Structures are given as structure tokens and as C-alpha cells.
Amino acid sequence: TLAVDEIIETISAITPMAQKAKKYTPPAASMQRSSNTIWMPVEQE
Amino acid sequence: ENRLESILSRFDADWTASDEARREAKNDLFFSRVSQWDDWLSQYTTLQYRGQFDVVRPVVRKLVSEMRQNPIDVLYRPKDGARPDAADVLMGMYRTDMRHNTAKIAVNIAVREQIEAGVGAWRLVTDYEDQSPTSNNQVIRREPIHSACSHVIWDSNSKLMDKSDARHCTVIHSMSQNGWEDFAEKYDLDADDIPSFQNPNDWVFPWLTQDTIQIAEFYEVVEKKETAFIYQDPVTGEPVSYFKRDIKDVIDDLADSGFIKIAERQIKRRRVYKSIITCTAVLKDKQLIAGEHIPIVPVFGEWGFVEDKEVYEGVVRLTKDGQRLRNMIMSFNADIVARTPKKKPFFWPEQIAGFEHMYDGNDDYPYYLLNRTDENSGDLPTQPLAYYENPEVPQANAYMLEAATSAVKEVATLGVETYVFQDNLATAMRRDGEIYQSIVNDIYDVPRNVTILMAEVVDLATGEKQVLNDIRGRYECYTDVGPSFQSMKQQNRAEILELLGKTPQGTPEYQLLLLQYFTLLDGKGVEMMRDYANKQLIQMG
Amino acid sequence: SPTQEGWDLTDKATGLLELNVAVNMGEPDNDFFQLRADDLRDETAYRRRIQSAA
Amino acid sequence: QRAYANVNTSLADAMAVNILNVKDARTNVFWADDAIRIVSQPIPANHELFAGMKTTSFSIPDVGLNGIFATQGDISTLSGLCRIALWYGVNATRPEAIGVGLPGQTA
């Protein structure tokens, strides 16, 4: 058998939404002993 | 946001980047220093014969001796257009604090590790010496680093052999309990909370107590613009001084002494911060240290990148296969010699029944007798006597022992000579000179030489502490590599002898000879000769 | 060592006797625990457990 | 052989034994310092156990003993095991030198 290893690409996906959504990385020890949740206040009225 | 998290993430990035090279370098160190049977690590085996018939230690010893016979040291030379003796003060300072045994030991350790594993390193530190200080009641000394491959974790984004473009470096120290207590005393840490970090050593030999306490020191360089104040020297000219170096101590003392502020500028420079850290906390955060470069100097053997991944190697790496094969074959042959039946006759019990004492090995009889008859079979069958074959070393064992030895012989030839390794050592020495120059300009009292004498201009604060003043025009000499000299008088003697070796027998030959007599030591006879030489020089004018 | 008095000690020599005792080891004393990769983001409990084990 | 004798007579037929600990009592213990020894060894890293484990040394404080700190990781469940082992044995090589003190042994 003769064979070549050039790939025939079939998928071209694009990521606008996860590129636009901001990424947040809180401190790991605090999340570990706070059960991976963190609270943020809401603008006061 | 967490400083600990940032420092960690950087350290693990570098420690993961440098995994394979560090493993191979540590294996090279173990192979060439402790044992060539890296079997204790993990193999479920029994007690057989394992001998080390070395063929690589002679080569390593020859290379280390060859590179020891040729010492190399920094040499400061004045830049183009600067005063012809701009580097004499710096050279004298450098010789003064690098003539010690610690500097030579650090260089020798780095060289041996460069020959064996592929990477070595040393460090430049400062201290307050009050009996014999180099300048400003301070001394710059050099310290060794052992097993630099696992103990100095450089920045992963560095593409220079001397790591001048590295921005951080973490140095790991493992010590015993008393070592930790004294470390804590030295650095004002809490000795009760025993620290712990990433263990750099592997328990590969039946050592009882290797080490249990680890800590690291994170050096980081920051290049930023900081305020520079321009003054007017009461003697002459305008000097420059950084704002941070005299922020509070003498900022109002220069005006009283006679310095008037002309201008204020922003000048870009580098600052170095050290953080003493453990795995779970930071003990010291961003302590300023002297100089603009990280004070760790690396020395490499064969160094390069394969694919965004660093590979460095000494001389031992390729000989490992042949050496292990040769050890295995020699052990197999030794087993052949030890456990193998010797050459003796094969007998039937009835062939020598009753005559068994003739054959025990004595020398009391003139011959050997055998039984000829059997009562049930008439006569014993006749067959030629057979002897157990003598042990023989197989042709495969002989061929492969010779072939593996030849392969090690052919591959353990560094270069043709250690020119490339000495050139890498020269690169490391140039880096050392650069770092030392920066630290000197930061902490020592460097005078300025006027052509109208050396002018040492300094002032003291209200707390009786001396604050040095160095103008910004400090890098007046660059760094080169020359022979190693213990002092400036020795350097001058070497220079005069070299010049005499090329001047013919004219009047300059007489001048250089009298100069050589002038620069001699003192007993009584050399004292008389030097007095005569100085008189003759003064008389000749 | 024993002892004997007198000038003549024919056939009264004695041999050498050296007794011995045996030493041996017991079963190891252990600490043993298991953790997941999400529980090692703090490491304080891990280090404290190691020291308490010692 | 008689050079090693340590009692005046031998055990001969129906001789009564006397138990010397007749009440419960916390013991006081004296010895000559070389009577108790602690034979200890680090567990070799080639052991059948500690097979896929990375093992280092581990200095037990106070006492002069060194055990083994072995660690292993699992990728299916992103887990890990730590095992600190210590291998030793306390041996009384001079029991005639070791002793005990029993106060208040009122029958």
C-alpha cells in the first residue's frame, strides 16, 4: 500500500462567545476551603 | 493577585519546562560521581555480582586537570575615549575580594559540574566585614552552588547561555535542622515553623539521612524609569544621583554640604528583588539587593535548544551506554569464572570402586588403577575417558566487551582539548564581571579620577550612616577575560615580563628591566635591587 | 574464661566458647492517606499531617 | 562452659516457683545503657511494595530513626497516596542488665 500523512482538514470552528466572555480566576486556597463559591456585592440602590 | 500564587505559578512553569534536562544531568552526576549501577532506584532483583570496571573516570580526570591548569579571570579594560587608567580601581577591588579561597572553590566546583553533567553555577553575595573591608565597611564574595541542574531553576523564557535575559530565578536550599536554625538566625525568620519546598534530590543511594528542610530564594529583575537628580559638585562639574539611593538619608544633606539641585530627570535602570519563600507562605517579600543583574552566574558545556526546550550536556552522557554494557559483560564473565564446575574426569562408581584414594589428588602412587571385571556382566564396558570441559568466555562476550570499550573510547573525546568548554567558562566569567561591576557601583565608594587625583566625595546622615555617591558616568570600563592574578602587583609583573619578552635589547629593554626590579617583593636582597632600580629610574628621568 | 592451678597441665587444655544473641525487626509502623487533586490547592493540611505523622 | 554460670544450683524436680508480681502496679524501669538497642533500617526502594511509588527519606525527630516517605499518583481518579513507613525493632540484648521496680507488692 502507498500512503502519505498529509492531514485532510475537515473542521474549522470559531469561538466568539468564549473569547468575549471575561475569565475570572479567584484564589485557589480560598476556593478550596470555601467550596468553590465566591460572593460579589450588587450595586446599591 | 496573590504574590505567593504568582511566584509559585512562575516556579512550576520553569520547573516543568526544565524536567528532562535536569533528570539527565542528575543521572550524569550520579553516574560519574557515586556509582555506575543505577539499579538501587527501582528493580526487584537478588544479590548477584556487580562490578564497576571504569573507563570514563580517567577521561573526566584528564579534562578537569587540563581545565585546572588554565585559570581564567575577569579583566577590566577602559572603554574607547575614557581615561587610560579608568579600570585600575575596579580591577584592584575585584582582585581584592576575589583572591579568596571561596571564589576559587566556586569556580572549580562549577567547572567540575560543567565537565560532568553539563551545567554548573555560582553566586555573588555581599556582607558587612569590619576587620578587612573592601570599601564602605562591606565586602563582595563569591559562593558555590552544588548540583546547579536541580538547585538553580532559571526562567524558562531565556535564550542566552549566561541567562542575561532571564527575569527571575529561584535557588533552592536544603539543610538539616541545625542548618535551618542558623539560616533562620541569619535571615530573621521564625525557626519554629519548619519550611518545606520542592525537594530537588532523589534518594537513589542507600544514604541514611539525606535532607528534610527546604526553602527557596526568588530573585527578580525589574527594568523601570526612576527619578534621577542632577546636582552641582562644589568642586567642579555636575554629578547625577538616583532619587531612591538618597531618598531620605542625605536628601537634605547635599544642600547643606554644598550641592545645589540643578535638574531632575527620569532614567531607566534595573533593580533586583529577593523573596525568601516556602511552599505555603512568603517569609520575606521583595527585599532589595545590590546590582541590576541576578547574582547567579551559570556555566554550560554543550548548550542549545531543540524545540523551545533547553538541552545541555557535559562529556559523560554518551559514554553511559557503553560503560554499562562493559560492566554487564565483565560481571557475566566473572560469574562464569566463579560458578562453573572445573575440569575433572567422569567416572562410574564401579570403575574406581576400591581405588578411590588414588584419585583424591595426592602424589603417593606412580599410576592410577581401575577395576576391569564385573561379576554379572563379565567385563566393564570400555569407553574413552571424558573430562568436564574447561570454562570458556563466549565469543559474543569477548567481542562485545571489546566493542563497547572501543565505543566509549571513540565517544569520550571532548573536542579533539577543552577549548569550547574554556570559552563557555570565559562567557560565564564575563557575566560575573558585569554583575560584580553593577554591585560595586551600587554599594562601594568608587572615586572619580580628575586630571587637574582621586576624589572621594561622600556624606553622612544624622544616623551616623554613610551614604555613597556615584555619578551616573560609571560604566567607563568593559569586561574581558585574561589570566588569573591574585593582586595588581602580580598583574603588573606579568605585564612587564610579557613586554620584556617582546622588546629587543635596546634602551626600552633596560627600562623594562629596571621596572621589573621596581615591582618586586621585599626581603633584603630584592630590597637592595629595588632601591637601586628606583634610584636609577629617577636619575635617568 | 576458666582457670586451673598447677604446673603440670597435660591434656588439660580447653577450647574457646563464644556465645551469641540474635536481633530482628518487627512489622513497619505506618501512616497512609489519600487525597484528590482539588484538595491540594491549600497544602497546609497536607504539611501538618506529615509533621503529625513524624 | 562453667565459666558462664550465673546461678548456684539448677532446676531440680518439684521446686516451687514464686511469682514476684502479685498486684498490678505501674513499673519503674532501670537498665545499663547498652542493654536495649533499636535495630532500624530504611525500607529499600526496590521493595515489592513501594513499587510504583517515588520514595525519599524521612527523618523521625528526637529519636535517631529514618523512615521512608513514598508517594504515588493516579490519573483515572486524579488522586494520590502518601505512605510514611518506619522499620525498626527494639531488642533487649542484656535482659540480665534490664530491670524493673515494683512498689507496693503486698500479697
Swiss-Prot record, chain A:
Provide the protein's localization: Virion
Coiled-coil residues:
none
Quaternary structure, per UniProt, is: Interacts (via N-terminus) with the capsid assembly scaffolding protein (via C-terminus); capsid proteins and scaffolding proteins form building blocks that assemble to form the procapsid. Interacts with the portal protein.
**In the UniProt entry, what is the domain comment?**
The insertion domain (I domain) plays an important role in the folding of the capsid protein by acting as an intramolecular chaperone.
Protein's job: Self-assembles to form an icosahedral capsid with a T=7 symmetry.
- Tell me which family the UniProt entry assigns to this protein: Belongs to the P22 phage major capsid protein family.
Q: What is this protein called?
A: Major capsid protein
Question: From what organism does this protein derive?
Answer: Salmonella phage P22
- Give me the gene this protein comes from: 5
Curated annotation (Swiss-Prot), chain B:
Q: Any idea what job this protein has?
A: Forms the portal vertex of the capsid. This portal plays critical roles in head assembly, genome packaging, neck/tail attachment, and genome ejection. Procapsid assembly may initiate with a nucleation complex composed of portal and scaffolding proteins. The portal protein multimerizes as a single ring-shaped homododecamer arranged around a central channel. Switches upon genome packaging from an asymmetrical conformation in the procapsid (PC-portal) to a symmetrical ring in the mature capsid (MV-portal). This change of conformation may serve as a signal for headful packaging.
Subunit info here reads:
Homododecamer. Interacts with the terminase large subunit; this interaction allows the packaging of viral DNA. Interacts (via C-terminus) with the head-to-tail adapter protein gp4; this interaction participates in the head completion. Interacts with the scaffolding protein; this interaction initiates procapsid assembly, thereby ensuring incorporation of only one portal ring per capsid. Interacts with the capsid protein.
Q: What is the protein named?
A: Portal protein
Q: Its Gene Ontology biological processes?
A: symbiont genome ejection through host cell envelope, short tail mechanism; viral DNA genome packaging; viral DNA genome packaging, headful; virion assembly
- Gene that this polypeptide is encoded by: 1
Q: Could you state one GO cellular component term attached to this entry?
A: viral portal complex
The subcellular location is: Virion
The main location class comes to: virion
Q: Which UniProt keywords apply?
A: Capsid protein, Late protein, Viral capsid assembly, Viral genome ejection through host cell envelope, Viral genome packaging, Viral penetration into host cytoplasm, Viral release from host cell, Viral short tail ejection system, Virion, Virus entry into host cell
Give the fragment's position in the full-length protein.
5 to 580 of 725
Its family?
Belongs to the p22likevirus portal protein family.
UniProtKB/Swiss-Prot annotation, chain C:
Site residues (Involved in capsid stabilization and maturation), renumbered to this chain: W7
**Subunit structure, per the record?**
Interacts (via N-terminus) with the capsid assembly scaffolding protein (via C-terminus); capsid proteins and scaffolding proteins form building blocks that assemble to form the procapsid. Interacts with the portal protein.
| Section of the entire sequence shown | 55 to 108 of 430
Entry comment, domain topic? The insertion domain (I domain) plays an important role in the folding of the capsid protein by acting as an intramolecular chaperone.
Protein name (record): Major capsid protein
Q: Where in the cell is it found?
A: Virion
Q: Which gene encodes it?
A: 5
- What does the function comment of this entry state? Self-assembles to form an icosahedral capsid with a T=7 symmetry.
Family per UniProt?
Answer: Belongs to the P22 phage major capsid protein family.
Show the taxonomic lineage. Viruses, Duplodnaviria, Heunggongvirae, Uroviricota, Caudoviricetes
Reported effect, W7 to N/V: Drastically decreases capsid stability
